[PDB]
Amino acid sequence: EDMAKIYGAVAAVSKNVNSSVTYEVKRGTHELIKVPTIPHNLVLIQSDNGK
């Protein structure tokens, strides 16, 4: 029984080691929008008679 207890403790200590680490890389990436219409700023001004 004492051998079993000792071996269990040793097995736990041996199993305590970790494999690896996973993570997501997302810094610096922003979302985007879509401008629907081109912003023209032209206005036509005409005289009443059209001269």
């Binding site: 970790n18 494999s19 690896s20 996973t22 993570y23 997501e24 997302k26 810094r27």
Partner: protein, 50 residues
């Protein structure tokens, strides 16, 4: 005549999973006793706890 051979249950090599799966270790015939991968939510675009 008698049907000696007509198809049968077929064995396929690979079990391809379409659904994307999170990282893991071996758990089939080979079992990995080490600690499972540690998920860290690094690289936060906005500060929360600093």
């Amino acid at each position: 005549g008698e049907i000696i051979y007509d198809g049968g249950l077929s064995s396929k090599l690979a079990d391809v999973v379409d659904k994307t799966t999170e990282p893991h270790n071996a758990d089939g015939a080979v079992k990995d006793g080490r600690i499972a991968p540690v998920k860290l939510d690094l690289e936060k675009q906005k500060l929360d706890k600093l």
